[PDB]
Amino acid sequence: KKYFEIRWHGRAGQGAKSASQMLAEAALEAGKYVQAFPEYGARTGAPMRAFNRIGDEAVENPDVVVVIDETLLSPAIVEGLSEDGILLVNTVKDFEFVRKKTGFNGKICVVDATDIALQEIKRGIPNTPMLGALVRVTGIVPLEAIEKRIEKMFFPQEVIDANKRALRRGYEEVKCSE
């Protein structure tokens, strides 16, 4: 109840750990209590998890599950996710497909983060648009806080702006089940 919780699923290389860090770093600058760490068992491309706990005045019961590689979708990936919780996915497919793969009745949000990134940052790493999508569907922090963080992690402004556009476009384009 004291912490809002998010559990990420991606494969080594897709940036779940960095995205997780960045979100945490954003909430930290806002004066929030935060925790964030990864959990591996790895090759490069090995499935992994990252976690965030962000105070709101091993994550077995997350408020949101974020799957940045559709390939990892399975009913195990949705363990502990309440019905009033969110399943957020990087996918070009639809809610029905995601529902079939997981068995999650509950809000399912999807966005083609890979393609947003190929367009904006010229890389198929989906983590920044997934962050923007996350901020959009949960409101867990303001988008400006992540942008401020994008500013601090970088480099010429061009590359900074491209990354901020990638965040904004995931924020704008995510679509929801309910």
From Swiss-Prot:
Sections of the chain in a coiled coil: none
GO molecular function, one term: pyruvate synthase activity
EC number: 1.2.7.1
Disulfide bonds: none
Uppermost EC category: oxidoreductase
Pfam families: POR (PF01558)
InterPro entries: Oxidoreductase_gamma_subunit (IPR051626), PorC_KorC (IPR011894), Pyruvate_synthase_PorC (IPR053412), Pyrv/ketoisovalerate_OxRed_cat (IPR019752), Pyrv_flavodox_OxRed_cen (IPR002869)
Catalytic activity from the UniProt record: 2 oxidized [2Fe-2S]-[ferredoxin] + pyruvate + CoA = 2 reduced [2Fe-2S]-[ferredoxin] + acetyl-CoA + CO2 + H(+)
Record keywords, A-Z: Oxidoreductase
Keyword DNA damage in record: no
Oligomeric and partner information: Heterotetramer of one alpha, one beta, one delta and one gamma chain.
Name recorded for this polypeptide: Pyruvate synthase subunit PorC
Record organism: Thermotoga maritima (strain ATCC 43589 / DSM 3109 / JCM 10099 / NBRC 100826 / MSB8)
